[PDB]
Structure 1
Amino acid sequence: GMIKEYRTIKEVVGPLMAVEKVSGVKYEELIEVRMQNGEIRRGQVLEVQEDKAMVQIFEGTSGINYKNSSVRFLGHPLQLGVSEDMIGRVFDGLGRPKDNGPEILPEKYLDINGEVINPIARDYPDEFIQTGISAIDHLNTLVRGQKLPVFSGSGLPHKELAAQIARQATVLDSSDDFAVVFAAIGITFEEAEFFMEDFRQTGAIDRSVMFMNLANDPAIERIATPRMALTAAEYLAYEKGMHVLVIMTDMTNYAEALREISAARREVPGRRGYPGYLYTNLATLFERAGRIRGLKGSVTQIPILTMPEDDKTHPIPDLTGYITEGQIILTRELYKSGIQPPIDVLPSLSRLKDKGTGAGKTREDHAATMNQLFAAYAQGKQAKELAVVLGESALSDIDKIYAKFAERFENEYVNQGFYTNRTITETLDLGWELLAMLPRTELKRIKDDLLDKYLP
């Protein structure tokens, strides 16, 4: 026995275990539980006082016995063995290979919590990423280094949207292709298999790293999975110079695992039983994105979450939206109308679009037409609502136009198809065609120099 083993388990409650008569244990230290059958389970020190330690077990505490099970403290935090050979390989939620491929000797081991980027060392993200999806490129622009999640719902095609983004995304310069780091968190085989099949069909699998926690894997492992994935991503980006696109789904499963631990520890809850530190904990993931001055690489995050009961005020989408740099919201109403992708632009947002667009980056008309399209669509939806309650006759002649604008905007602009890749030029041109439906005097968001040059 290289490491001292303790048979001093004194409490086993769900994922929680208490261990007595210990010494030299540290907060967040990695532990291993050895059982009589020889199974090895891993865990993490949640707190230490005097000679006692509280630990959370990743694989659960089933079968654990005070006499049969021994605990050993490894003297370091949970780390990921990183290496360039991880590209093209598939791992489980704890970073162990699961593809029956060749063994991998890590270049080095990195604490999966990582470190905070010094704010003054950051390079502000401003490189337009052409996803080829108009509702995003034009109205909720993605830039390289951003964290921009998809907010969705059960039964909605968020996996199709995410795979289309990964398939079509490119900066307009001569940069190398994105390396993709994919984290599966509590999702079904079929959800995970959709991504696998798309990555293999395009060949993206050859430039991808995948960390697979599935719905049959222990729920507490979900808490380590995105930290494993972000540690690989930051290593590939800042140590190897790659542009990394991180896709993580489903973050609702992540927060529910956090709540499982929090509830077992009997912490005092915030709203809906979620821990008071849910915001801070989520931020330690989503802030691991961006660019660093003097470094060539980057980390772009597309987290994906399902809003419980389609409610955006639920703590999980709510606190995520307080952290991330916008959000792309899918709705069931647009999805039942056959709009693909079913993006509702009205509650969607990108916070980094101003410096990534305009003359020299996309085109000079980008910001003004974006603002005008958004305003007209808002008025048009309002007219449509009034026509539902009061009939078409109730609408005024101008509001009849806006209702028709909103209809064409959804059917022809947003609804482009999951295998359609529009250039930013085609997107901007399509915008002017819709704006041409409206009277020119209604285009208050656009100055005359642009109107005279682009309006048909």
Structure 2
Amino acid sequence: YGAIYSVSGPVVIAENMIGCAMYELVKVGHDNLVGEVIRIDGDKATIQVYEETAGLTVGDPVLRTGKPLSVELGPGLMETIYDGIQRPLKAIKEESQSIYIPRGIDTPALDRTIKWQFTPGKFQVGDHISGGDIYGSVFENSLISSHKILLPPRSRGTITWIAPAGEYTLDEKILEVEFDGKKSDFTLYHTWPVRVPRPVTEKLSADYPLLTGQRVLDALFPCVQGGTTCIPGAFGCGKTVISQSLSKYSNSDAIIYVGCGERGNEMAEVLMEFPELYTEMSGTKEPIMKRTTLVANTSNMPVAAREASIYTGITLAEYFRDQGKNVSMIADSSSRWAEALREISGRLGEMPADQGFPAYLGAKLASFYERAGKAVALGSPDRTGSVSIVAAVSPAGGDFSDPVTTATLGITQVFWGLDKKLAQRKHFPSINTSVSYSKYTNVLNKFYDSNYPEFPVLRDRMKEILSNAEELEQVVQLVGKSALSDSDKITLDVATLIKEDFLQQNGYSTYDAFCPIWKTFDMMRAFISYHDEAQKAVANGANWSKLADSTGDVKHAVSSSKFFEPSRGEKEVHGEFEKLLSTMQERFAESTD
């Protein structure tokens, strides 16, 4: 149809575009570069191009697909890795047979030539079907044994023909729904515009923790299945490793790992690592890559595609929410999405808001984060999914006041603010306990009282003594340890113990790669009991200076309590912790005689 009229970086103006609609996919150039209309100046329609724009000339035809950016949901969507435009990368490397992505390569998003075993659902011929109803299940892979195929929303009617059990490709007709006289026929895959969230029946309240296997994140600043978590932090501060640990160790029946704007290696090592790593939720050691979809769009990949990547990832996660899987989308840096928005807007030369970012950044981030939340899936049979967006915020210069962080805050219920100063001394996961918060501690009390009743009290005690340590250090770095009382000294020593042995977690060693919730709770009891016994012994008369060397074995036992291998089993580890508690109490009773 219309021809090019301007190519100013990732922004292309196309003339003769009289029928174009805002946000409508529009193929560009002779090799069909993908792009979205974003403005109209008459018949001229400013369009982003989601691929490397170098080499477009005035006059290159631009087609109007007449449909917004659609992501092909369905089977075969889970194990693989996608570019930001929902194109598989394994298929690209097998097609072009070259280590680069060709510009304009048109690969069907899902493999159309894999015969998926299909088992028809409860609905039969004549049963009224509504948007979101599950009409069958496909054995996608071992871990996702029942990938419930569901009717796409915005489509209803009465089933006229259904496909019996068997195996089908993604193009074979599965059922035919009659609405009015129109008889639409559906297949395994169904497209969906990413710009609009997948509808849900109702959005419940997130009240089951996203056990992220990290000690400080699990204990002091928990996140909830359906909660929205941001991890602002300077470069080299642990955002990506925290995200990867949360992806490969949390309790979440699916993972969408959207790497919009990171180095390719932190996405190649995910492919290298996940298959050799196993889980236990299904009841058998099965590789975790069976459940995680990588939506990769590295930094040097076309910048306009970062936004498309973040939206494709959130729509994939929301789809797996419609099946009941407690998916947890993991944006690797929402800041690079904001960078893409800034670069596009500045290329349009319009609305420089705070720090050059576009004005609408707050609205887009709010809508994106609100696309999360544990909700009852649409239609029937009834099922409750959850999308919990964890998104590193990567502020420029490490400044918390950087506008993408400030916009991200106020909409994210959890804020694991990382600190560069702690990450410099290799104090993992480098979270800053002073300013981090989690608005989800108030709703988790039900789970805690159901499972670990004295967890919240211990968390409050730990944060209290940590804050006491912070103010005491503020005093000491100006006055010195002389003016400290003895209780102040014990608070400082116990807080140093915590900051070096509980909050810290190597993240890669076999013993602290995944600290399960029961071990974390046990160590909270151990550390707080050590502090309580030491405080009591100091109160009962024994000066802590003498006590330090006499009970040094107990303090070292507490410090080495983090080496208790999590794979040893709950019974073994809890028995070891009860032994440690008893030894603590007896030795502190003996030493105060």
Q: TM-score range by the shorter chain?
A: 0.7 to 0.9
1:428 aligns with 2:521: yes
Alignment match, 1:196: 271
* Offset, 1:163: 2.1
Whole-Å separation in 1 of the counterparts to 2:65 and 2:443: 47
Whole-Å separation in 1 of the counterparts to 2:40 and 2:537: 69
Alignment match, 2:293: 209
Give the 5 Å matches for 1:5-154.
5-7=1-3, 9-35=4-30, 39-67=31-59, 69-100=60-91, 103-104=111-112, 105=170, 107-115=189-197, 121-154=202-235
Alignment match, 1:169: 250
Distance 1:108 1:407, change over 3 A: same
* Offset, 1:116: 7.0
Identity of aligned residues (%): 23
Whole-Å separation in 1 of the counterparts to 2:198 and 2:350: 26
Q: TM-score, normalised to structure 1's length?
A: 0.87
Alignment partner for residue 280 of structure 1, among 363, 369, 393?
363
**Runs of 5+ unmatched residues, structure 2:** 95-109, 113-169, 171-187, 278-286, 377-381, 539-581, 586-593
* Offset, 1:324: 1.1
Whole-Å separation in 2 of the counterparts to 1:440 and 1:268: 62
Alignment match, 1:446: none
* Offset, 1:245: 1.8
Whole-Å separation in 1 of the counterparts to 2:304 and 2:316: 20
Whole-Å separation in 2 of the counterparts to 1:396 and 1:360: 36
Deviations 1:78-98 (A, max 9, x none): 111111211111111111111
3-state SS in 1 of match to 2:328: strand
3-state SS in 2 of match to 1:152: coil
Distance 1:55 1:398, change over 3 A: same
Alignment match, 1:366: 455
3-state SS in 1 of match to 2:28: strand
Whole-Å separation in 1 of the counterparts to 2:516 and 2:290: 26
Deviations 1:146-174 (A, max 9, x none): 1212222212232222222223222xxxx
Distance 1:411 1:81, change over 3 A: same
Query: Is the contact made by 1:151 and 1:306 (CA closer than 8 Å) also made in structure 2?
Result: yes
Query: Is the contact made by 1:180 and 1:245 (CA closer than 8 Å) also made in structure 2?
Result: yes
* Offset, 1:407: 0.7
* Offset, 1:378: 1.1
Which one-letter code corresponds to 1:56 in the other structure? Q
Equivalenced residue count is 428
Distance 1:335 1:190, change over 3 A: same
Deviates further, 100-109 or 58-67? 100-109
Whole-Å separation in 2 of the counterparts to 1:205 and 1:320: 29
Whole-Å separation in 2 of the counterparts to 1:263 and 1:169: 39
Greater radius of gyration (CA):
2
Give the 5 Å matches for 1:256-335.
256-293=339-376, 294-335=382-423
1:233 aligns with 2:233: no
3-state SS in 1 of match to 2:493: helix
Distance 1:65 1:222, change over 3 A: same
Whole-Å separation in 2 of the counterparts to 1:149 and 1:422: 21
- Over the aligned positions, Cα root-mean-square deviation in angstroms equals 2.5
Distance 1:312 1:88, change over 3 A: same
Query: Is the contact made by 1:128 and 1:357 (CA closer than 8 Å) also made in structure 2?
Result: no
* Offset, 1:270: 1.9
Whole-Å separation in 1 of the counterparts to 2:413 and 2:451: 20
Query: Is the contact made by 1:357 and 1:363 (CA closer than 8 Å) also made in structure 2?
Result: no
Whole-Å separation in 1 of the counterparts to 2:525 and 2:463: 13
Deviations 1:269-293 (A, max 9, x none): 2211111111111122211211223
Deviations 1:364-394 (A, max 9, x none): 2222222222122012022123322333224
**Runs of 5+ unmatched residues, structure 1:** 171-176, 443-453
Query: Is the contact made by 1:131 and 1:165 (CA closer than 8 Å) also made in structure 2?
Result: yes
Whole-Å separation in 2 of the counterparts to 1:352 and 1:117: 24
Whole-Å separation in 2 of the counterparts to 1:54 and 1:434: 60
Query: Is the contact made by 2:10 and 2:344 (CA closer than 8 Å) also made in structure 1?
Result: yes
Q: TM-score, normalised to structure 2's length?
A: 0.68
Which one-letter code corresponds to 1:87 in the other structure? M
Distance 1:362 1:140, change over 3 A: farther
Alignment match, 2:255: 180
3-state SS in 2 of match to 1:86: coil
Query: Is the contact made by 2:236 and 2:423 (CA closer than 8 Å) also made in structure 1?
Result: no
Deviates further, 382-391 or 265-274? 382-391
Whole-Å separation in 1 of the counterparts to 2:216 and 2:537: 25
Whole-Å separation in 2 of the counterparts to 1:425 and 1:189: 35
3-state SS in 2 of match to 1:283: helix
Query: Is the contact made by 1:143 and 1:353 (CA closer than 8 Å) also made in structure 2?
Result: no
Whole-Å separation in 2 of the counterparts to 1:24 and 1:336: 55
Query: Is the contact made by 1:147 and 1:302 (CA closer than 8 Å) also made in structure 2?
Result: yes
Whole-Å separation in 1 of the counterparts to 2:32 and 2:477: 62
* Offset, 1:60: 4.3
Whole-Å separation in 1 of the counterparts to 2:456 and 2:39: 51
Which one-letter code corresponds to 2:111 in the other structure? E
* Offset, 1:117: 5.6
3-state SS in 1 of match to 2:66: strand
Query: Is the contact made by 2:10 and 2:303 (CA closer than 8 Å) also made in structure 1?
Result: no
Which one-letter code corresponds to 1:6 in the other structure? G
Distance 1:132 1:34, change over 3 A: closer
Whole-Å separation in 2 of the counterparts to 1:355 and 1:375: 20
Whole-Å separation in 2 of the counterparts to 1:307 and 1:41: 31
Structure scoring higher RCO (CA < 8 A, sep ≥ 6) equals: 1
1:247 aligns with 2:322: no
3-state SS in 2 of match to 1:74: coil
Deviates further, 211-220 or 292-301? 292-301
Deviations 1:188-236 (A, max 9, x none): 1221123222212212111121111112311111110011111111112
3-state SS in 1 of match to 2:387: strand
* Offset, 1:441: 13
Tell me which protein shows more strand as a share of its residues: 1
Whole-Å separation in 2 of the counterparts to 1:251 and 1:158: 12
